[PDB]
Amino acid sequence: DVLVKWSEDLANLPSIDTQHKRLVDYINDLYRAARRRDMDKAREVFDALKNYAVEHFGYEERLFADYAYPEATRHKEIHRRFVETVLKWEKQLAAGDPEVVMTTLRGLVDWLVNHIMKEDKKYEAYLRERGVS
């Protein structure tokens, strides 16, 4: 049913929480599709997850630019490398089965939870003190 449950460990600015929660929702939708052994749905949800991640990353990067965040370059490159990684993982889904979907899902969750807690956390105080919400 649910692979990832939201918790305070993932919390950041309120607007950012809406996007991270949406990503967690896509992860759980992809888990559900894998459990149902529905590969067409899994490929559809994976595509939609990737596309939303790109837009979430762009929203963060726009905050970094607007607010002259000193680690903008580093954090953008981290996002870019993960987009590249996600595009590589996507290729396996064409011939994959639900077990490939699960392995992929574990990689997605591991990256996202670490990224939110380790990298996204670094911009939070910086943006809060500048009035971002």
Side-chain angles (χ1 to χ4, degrees):
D1 189 18
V2 153
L3 184 62
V4 176
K5 172 245 177 211
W6 189 256
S7 71
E8 184 67 12
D9 289 357
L10 302 184
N12 195 296
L13 296 170
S15 66
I16 289 292
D17 280 3
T18 73
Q19 302 171 14
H20 291 156
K21 282 174 183 186
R22 207 151 169 103
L23 281 161
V24 167
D25 295 336
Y26 276 115
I27 286 162
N28 290 328
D29 287 345
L30 181 58
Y31 181 56
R32 196 172 60 250
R35 286 234 298 144
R36 283 194 276 106
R37 307 188 69 80
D38 188 339
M39 290 304 305
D40 279 347
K41 181 66 170 283
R43 288 184 283 264
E44 175 181 302
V45 171
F46 185 98
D47 191 46
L49 190 164
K50 163 189 73 174
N51 290 330
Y52 185 75
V54 167
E55 299 192 353
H56 160 62
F57 296 159
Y59 184 96
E60 290 190 349
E61 290 156 21
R62 175 56 178 281
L63 283 171
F64 298 162
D66 278 355
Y67 293 92
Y69 179 57
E71 301 301 316
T73 285
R74 285 177 176 278
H75 196 135
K76 182 175 293 95
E77 179 58 15
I78 287 172
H79 288 165
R80 193 200 64 75
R81 294 177 180 204
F82 184 62
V83 177
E84 189 163 341
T85 291
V86 171
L87 287 161
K88 290 170 151 174
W89 291 346
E90 193 166 29
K91 305 283 186 35
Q92 300 277 344
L93 306 183
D97 59 14
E99 291 73 26
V100 170
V101 180
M102 297 298 331
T103 301
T104 309
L105 263 167
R106 288 190 274 103
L108 288 166
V109 170
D110 288 342
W111 188 93
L112 200 75
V113 170
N114 179 73
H115 181 82
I116 290 168
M117 295 180 72
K118 172 195 186 177
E119 303 294 347
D120 291 344
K121 182 53 63 173
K122 288 171 180 178
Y123 64 59
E124 185 182 359
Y126 180 91
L127 294 177
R128 282 182 180 273
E129 70 178 348
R130 288 159 182 79
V132 185
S133 51

Coordinates of all heavy atoms in Angstrom, one line a residue, residues 4 6-7 10-29 48-64 75 79 82 111-113 115-116 120 123 127 132-133:
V4 N 6.4 4.8 1.6 CA 7.0 5.9 2.4 C 5.9 6.7 3.1 O 4.9 7.1 2.5 CB 7.8 6.9 1.5 CG1 8.3 8.1 2.2 CG2 8.9 6.2 0.8
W6 N 5.0 10.1 5.2 CA 5.6 11.4 5.6 C 5.9 11.4 7.1 O 5.2 10.9 7.9 CB 4.5 12.5 5.3 CG 5.1 13.8 5.4 CD1 4.9 14.7 6.5 CD2 6.0 14.5 4.5 NE1 5.6 15.9 6.2 CE2 6.3 15.8 5.0 CE3 6.6 14.1 3.3 CZ2 7.1 16.7 4.4 CZ3 7.4 15.0 2.7 CH2 7.7 16.3 3.2
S7 N 7.0 12.1 7.4 CA 7.3 12.4 8.8 C 8.0 13.7 8.8 O 8.5 14.3 7.8 CB 8.1 11.3 9.4 OG 9.4 11.3 8.9
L10 N 11.2 14.7 7.0 CA 11.2 15.3 5.7 C 10.8 16.7 5.6 O 10.8 17.3 4.5 CB 10.4 14.4 4.7 CG 10.8 12.9 4.6 CD1 9.9 12.2 3.6 CD2 12.3 12.7 4.3
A11 N 10.4 17.3 6.7 CA 9.8 18.7 6.7 C 10.9 19.8 6.4 O 12.0 19.6 6.7 CB 9.2 18.9 8.1
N12 N 10.4 20.8 5.8 CA 11.3 21.9 5.4 C 10.3 23.2 5.4 O 9.5 23.3 6.3 CB 11.9 21.6 4.0 CG 13.1 22.5 3.6 OD1 13.0 23.7 3.4 ND2 14.3 21.9 3.4
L13 N 10.5 24.1 4.4 CA 9.6 25.2 4.3 C 8.2 24.7 3.9 O 8.1 23.7 3.3 CB 10.0 26.1 3.1 CG 11.4 26.8 3.3 CD1 11.8 27.4 2.0 CD2 11.3 27.9 4.4
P14 N 7.1 25.4 4.3 CA 5.8 24.9 4.0 C 5.6 24.7 2.5 O 5.0 23.6 2.0 CB 4.8 25.9 4.5 CG 5.6 26.5 5.7 CD 7.0 26.5 5.3
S15 N 6.0 25.6 1.6 CA 5.8 25.4 0.2 C 6.6 24.2 -0.4 O 6.1 23.5 -1.3 CB 6.1 26.7 -0.6 OG 7.5 27.0 -0.6
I16 N 7.8 24.0 0.2 CA 8.6 22.9 -0.2 C 8.0 21.6 0.3 O 8.0 20.5 -0.5 CB 10.0 23.1 0.3 CG1 10.7 24.2 -0.4 CG2 10.8 21.8 0.3 CD1 11.1 23.9 -1.9
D17 N 7.4 21.5 1.4 CA 6.7 20.4 1.9 C 5.6 19.9 0.9 O 5.4 18.7 0.7 CB 6.0 20.6 3.3 CG 6.9 20.6 4.5 OD1 8.1 20.4 4.4 OD2 6.3 20.8 5.6
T18 N 4.9 20.9 0.3 CA 3.9 20.4 -0.7 C 4.5 19.6 -1.8 O 3.9 18.7 -2.3 CB 3.1 21.6 -1.2 OG1 3.9 22.4 -2.1 CG2 2.6 22.5 -0.1
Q19 N 5.7 20.0 -2.3 CA 6.3 19.3 -3.4 C 7.0 18.0 -3.0 O 6.8 16.9 -3.7 CB 7.3 20.3 -4.0 CG 6.6 21.5 -4.6 CD 7.6 22.5 -5.0 OE1 8.8 22.4 -5.2 NE2 7.0 23.7 -5.3
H20 N 7.7 17.9 -1.9 CA 8.2 16.7 -1.3 C 7.1 15.7 -1.0 O 7.2 14.5 -1.3 CB 9.1 17.0 -0.1 CG 10.4 17.7 -0.5 ND1 11.1 18.5 0.4 CD2 11.1 17.7 -1.7 CE1 12.2 18.9 -0.3 NE2 12.2 18.5 -1.5
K21 N 5.9 16.2 -0.5 CA 4.8 15.3 -0.2 C 4.2 14.8 -1.5 O 3.9 13.6 -1.6 CB 3.7 16.0 0.5 CG 4.0 16.2 2.0 CD 2.9 17.0 2.7 CE 3.2 17.3 4.1 NZ 2.0 18.0 4.7
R22 N 4.1 15.6 -2.6 CA 3.7 15.1 -3.9 C 4.7 14.1 -4.4 O 4.2 13.1 -5.0 CB 3.5 16.3 -4.8 CG 2.5 16.1 -5.9 CD 1.8 17.4 -6.4 NE 1.1 17.1 -7.6 CZ -0.2 16.9 -7.6 NH1 -1.0 17.1 -6.6 NH2 -0.8 16.5 -8.8
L23 N 6.0 14.2 -4.2 CA 6.9 13.2 -4.7 C 6.7 11.9 -3.9 O 6.8 10.8 -4.5 CB 8.4 13.7 -4.5 CG 8.8 14.6 -5.6 CD1 10.0 15.4 -5.2 CD2 9.0 13.9 -6.9
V24 N 6.5 12.0 -2.6 CA 6.2 10.8 -1.8 C 4.9 10.1 -2.3 O 4.9 8.9 -2.5 CB 6.1 11.2 -0.3 CG1 5.5 10.0 0.5 CG2 7.5 11.6 0.3
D25 N 3.9 10.9 -2.7 CA 2.7 10.4 -3.2 C 3.0 9.6 -4.6 O 2.4 8.6 -4.8 CB 1.6 11.4 -3.4 CG 1.0 12.0 -2.1 OD1 1.2 11.4 -1.0 OD2 0.5 13.1 -2.1
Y26 N 3.8 10.2 -5.4 CA 4.1 9.5 -6.7 C 4.9 8.2 -6.3 O 4.6 7.2 -7.0 CB 5.0 10.4 -7.6 CG 4.3 11.3 -8.5 CD1 4.4 12.7 -8.3 CD2 3.4 10.9 -9.5 CE1 3.8 13.6 -9.1 CE2 2.8 11.8 -10.3 CZ 2.9 13.1 -10.1 OH 2.3 14.0 -11.0
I27 N 5.8 8.2 -5.4 CA 6.5 7.0 -5.0 C 5.5 5.9 -4.6 O 5.6 4.8 -5.0 CB 7.5 7.3 -3.8 CG1 8.7 8.0 -4.4 CG2 7.9 6.0 -3.2 CD1 9.5 8.7 -3.3
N28 N 4.5 6.3 -3.8 CA 3.5 5.3 -3.3 C 2.6 4.9 -4.4 O 2.2 3.7 -4.5 CB 2.8 5.9 -2.1 CG 3.6 6.0 -0.9 OD1 4.5 5.2 -0.7 ND2 3.4 7.0 0.0
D29 N 2.3 5.8 -5.3 CA 1.5 5.3 -6.5 C 2.3 4.3 -7.3 O 1.8 3.4 -7.8 CB 1.2 6.5 -7.5 CG 0.2 7.5 -6.9 OD1 -0.6 7.2 -6.0 OD2 0.1 8.6 -7.5
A48 N 5.6 10.3 -14.9 CA 5.0 11.4 -14.2 C 5.8 11.9 -13.0 O 6.0 13.1 -12.7 CB 3.6 11.1 -13.8
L49 N 6.4 10.9 -12.2 CA 7.3 11.2 -11.1 C 8.5 11.9 -11.6 O 8.9 12.9 -10.9 CB 7.6 9.8 -10.4 CG 8.4 9.8 -9.1 CD1 8.3 8.4 -8.5 CD2 9.9 10.2 -9.2
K50 N 9.1 11.4 -12.6 CA 10.3 12.0 -13.1 C 10.0 13.5 -13.5 O 10.8 14.4 -13.2 CB 10.8 11.2 -14.3 CG 11.8 11.9 -15.2 CD 12.1 11.1 -16.5 CE 10.9 11.2 -17.4 NZ 11.1 10.5 -18.8
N51 N 8.9 13.7 -14.3 CA 8.6 15.0 -14.8 C 8.3 16.0 -13.6 O 8.8 17.1 -13.6 CB 7.5 14.9 -15.8 CG 7.8 14.3 -17.1 OD1 9.0 14.3 -17.5 ND2 6.9 13.6 -17.7
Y52 N 7.7 15.5 -12.6 CA 7.4 16.3 -11.4 C 8.7 16.6 -10.7 O 8.9 17.8 -10.3 CB 6.4 15.7 -10.5 CG 6.0 16.6 -9.4 CD1 5.2 17.7 -9.7 CD2 6.5 16.5 -8.1 CE1 4.8 18.6 -8.6 CE2 6.1 17.4 -7.1 CZ 5.3 18.4 -7.4 OH 4.9 19.3 -6.4
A53 N 9.6 15.6 -10.5 CA 10.8 15.9 -9.9 C 11.6 17.0 -10.6 O 12.1 17.9 -9.9 CB 11.7 14.6 -9.7
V54 N 11.7 17.0 -11.9 CA 12.3 18.0 -12.7 C 11.7 19.4 -12.3 O 12.4 20.4 -12.2 CB 12.3 17.7 -14.2 CG1 12.7 19.0 -15.0 CG2 13.2 16.6 -14.5
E55 N 10.4 19.5 -12.2 CA 9.8 20.8 -11.9 C 10.0 21.2 -10.5 O 10.3 22.4 -10.2 CB 8.3 20.7 -12.3 CG 8.2 20.5 -13.8 CD 6.8 20.7 -14.4 OE1 5.8 21.0 -13.6 OE2 6.7 20.6 -15.6
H56 N 10.1 20.2 -9.5 CA 10.4 20.5 -8.1 C 11.8 21.0 -8.0 O 12.1 22.1 -7.4 CB 10.2 19.3 -7.3 CG 10.9 19.3 -6.0 ND1 10.6 20.3 -5.0 CD2 12.0 18.6 -5.5 CE1 11.4 20.2 -4.0 NE2 12.3 19.2 -4.3
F57 N 12.7 20.3 -8.7 CA 14.1 20.8 -8.7 C 14.2 22.2 -9.3 O 15.0 23.0 -8.8 CB 15.0 19.8 -9.5 CG 15.1 18.4 -8.9 CD1 15.5 17.4 -9.8 CD2 14.9 18.1 -7.6 CE1 15.6 16.1 -9.3 CE2 15.0 16.8 -7.1 CZ 15.4 15.8 -8.0
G58 N 13.5 22.5 -10.4 CA 13.5 23.8 -11.0 C 13.0 24.9 -10.0 O 13.5 26.0 -10.0
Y59 N 12.0 24.6 -9.2 CA 11.4 25.5 -8.2 C 12.5 25.8 -7.2 O 12.7 26.9 -6.8 CB 10.2 24.8 -7.6 CG 9.4 25.7 -6.7 CD1 8.3 26.5 -7.1 CD2 9.7 25.8 -5.3 CE1 7.6 27.3 -6.2 CE2 9.0 26.6 -4.4 CZ 7.9 27.3 -4.9 OH 7.2 28.1 -4.0
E60 N 13.1 24.8 -6.7 CA 14.2 25.0 -5.7 C 15.3 25.9 -6.3 O 15.8 26.8 -5.7 CB 14.8 23.7 -5.2 CG 14.0 22.9 -4.2 CD 14.7 21.8 -3.6 OE1 15.9 21.5 -4.0 OE2 14.1 21.1 -2.8
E61 N 15.7 25.5 -7.5 CA 16.8 26.3 -8.2 C 16.4 27.8 -8.4 O 17.2 28.7 -8.4 CB 17.2 25.6 -9.5 CG 17.9 24.3 -9.3 CD 17.9 23.3 -10.4 OE1 17.6 23.7 -11.6 OE2 18.1 22.1 -10.1
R62 N 15.1 28.0 -8.6 CA 14.6 29.4 -8.8 C 14.7 30.1 -7.5 O 15.1 31.3 -7.4 CB 13.2 29.4 -9.3 CG 12.6 30.8 -9.4 CD 13.5 31.8 -10.2 NE 12.8 33.1 -10.3 CZ 11.7 33.3 -11.1 NH1 11.3 32.4 -11.9 NH2 11.2 34.5 -11.0
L63 N 14.4 29.5 -6.4 CA 14.5 30.1 -5.0 C 16.0 30.3 -4.8 O 16.4 31.4 -4.3 CB 14.0 29.1 -3.9 CG 12.5 29.0 -3.8 CD1 12.2 27.9 -2.9 CD2 11.9 30.4 -3.3
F64 N 16.9 29.4 -5.2 CA 18.3 29.6 -5.0 C 18.8 30.8 -5.8 O 19.6 31.6 -5.2 CB 19.1 28.4 -5.5 CG 18.8 27.1 -4.8 CD1 19.2 25.9 -5.5 CD2 18.2 27.0 -3.6 CE1 18.9 24.7 -4.9 CE2 17.9 25.7 -3.1 CZ 18.2 24.6 -3.8
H75 N 24.0 22.4 -5.5 CA 22.8 21.7 -5.3 C 22.1 21.5 -6.7 O 21.6 20.4 -7.0 CB 21.9 22.6 -4.4 CG 20.7 21.8 -3.9 ND1 20.4 21.9 -2.5 CD2 19.7 21.1 -4.5 CE1 19.3 21.2 -2.3 NE2 18.9 20.7 -3.5
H79 N 21.0 17.8 -8.4 CA 19.7 17.6 -9.1 C 19.9 17.1 -10.5 O 19.3 16.1 -10.9 CB 18.9 18.9 -9.2 CG 18.3 19.4 -7.9 ND1 17.8 20.7 -7.8 CD2 18.1 18.8 -6.7 CE1 17.3 20.8 -6.6 NE2 17.5 19.7 -5.9
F82 N 21.0 13.4 -10.6 CA 19.9 12.5 -10.4 C 18.9 12.4 -11.5 O 18.4 11.3 -11.8 CB 19.2 13.0 -9.1 CG 18.1 12.0 -8.7 CD1 18.4 10.7 -8.4 CD2 16.8 12.4 -8.6 CE1 17.3 9.8 -8.0 CE2 15.7 11.6 -8.3 CZ 16.1 10.3 -7.9
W111 N 17.5 7.7 -2.7 CA 18.0 9.0 -3.1 C 17.2 10.2 -2.5 O 17.8 11.1 -1.9 CB 18.1 9.1 -4.6 CG 18.8 10.4 -5.0 CD1 20.1 10.5 -5.3 CD2 18.3 11.7 -5.2 NE1 20.5 11.8 -5.7 CE2 19.3 12.5 -5.6 CE3 17.0 12.3 -5.0 CZ2 19.2 13.9 -5.8 CZ3 16.8 13.7 -5.2 CH2 17.9 14.5 -5.7
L112 N 15.9 10.1 -2.6 CA 15.0 11.2 -2.2 C 15.1 11.5 -0.7 O 15.2 12.6 -0.3 CB 13.6 10.9 -2.7 CG 12.6 12.1 -2.8 CD1 13.0 12.9 -4.1 CD2 11.2 11.5 -3.0
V113 N 15.0 10.4 0.1 CA 15.0 10.6 1.5 C 16.4 11.2 1.9 O 16.4 12.2 2.7 CB 14.8 9.3 2.2 CG1 15.0 9.4 3.7 CG2 13.3 9.0 2.0
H115 N 18.5 13.0 0.0 CA 18.6 14.3 -0.5 C 17.8 15.4 0.3 O 18.3 16.5 0.5 CB 18.1 14.3 -2.0 CG 18.2 15.7 -2.6 ND1 19.4 16.2 -3.1 CD2 17.3 16.6 -2.8 CE1 19.2 17.4 -3.6 NE2 18.0 17.7 -3.4
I116 N 16.6 15.0 0.6 CA 15.7 15.9 1.4 C 16.4 16.2 2.8 O 16.5 17.4 3.2 CB 14.3 15.3 1.6 CG1 13.6 15.3 0.3 CG2 13.5 16.1 2.6 CD1 12.3 14.5 0.3
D120 N 18.5 19.3 0.9 CA 17.5 20.3 1.0 C 17.4 21.0 2.4 O 17.2 22.2 2.5 CB 16.1 19.7 0.6 CG 16.0 19.4 -0.8 OD1 16.8 19.8 -1.6 OD2 15.0 18.6 -1.2
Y123 N 19.3 24.4 2.9 CA 18.8 25.7 2.4 C 17.7 26.3 3.3 O 17.3 27.5 3.2 CB 18.4 25.7 0.9 CG 17.2 24.8 0.6 CD1 16.0 25.0 1.2 CD2 17.4 23.8 -0.4 CE1 14.9 24.2 0.9 CE2 16.3 23.0 -0.7 CZ 15.1 23.2 -0.1 OH 14.0 22.4 -0.5
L127 N 16.7 30.3 3.8 CA 15.5 30.9 3.1 C 14.5 31.4 4.1 O 13.9 32.5 3.9 CB 14.9 29.8 2.2 CG 15.8 29.6 1.0 CD1 15.1 28.5 0.1 CD2 16.0 30.8 0.1
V132 N 11.1 33.5 3.1 CA 10.5 32.6 2.1 C 9.6 31.7 2.9 O 9.8 31.4 4.1 CB 11.6 31.8 1.4 CG1 10.9 30.9 0.3 CG2 12.6 32.7 0.7
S133 N 8.5 31.2 2.3 CA 7.6 30.3 2.9 C 7.3 29.1 2.1 O 6.6 28.2 2.4 CB 6.3 30.9 3.4 OG 5.7 31.6 2.3

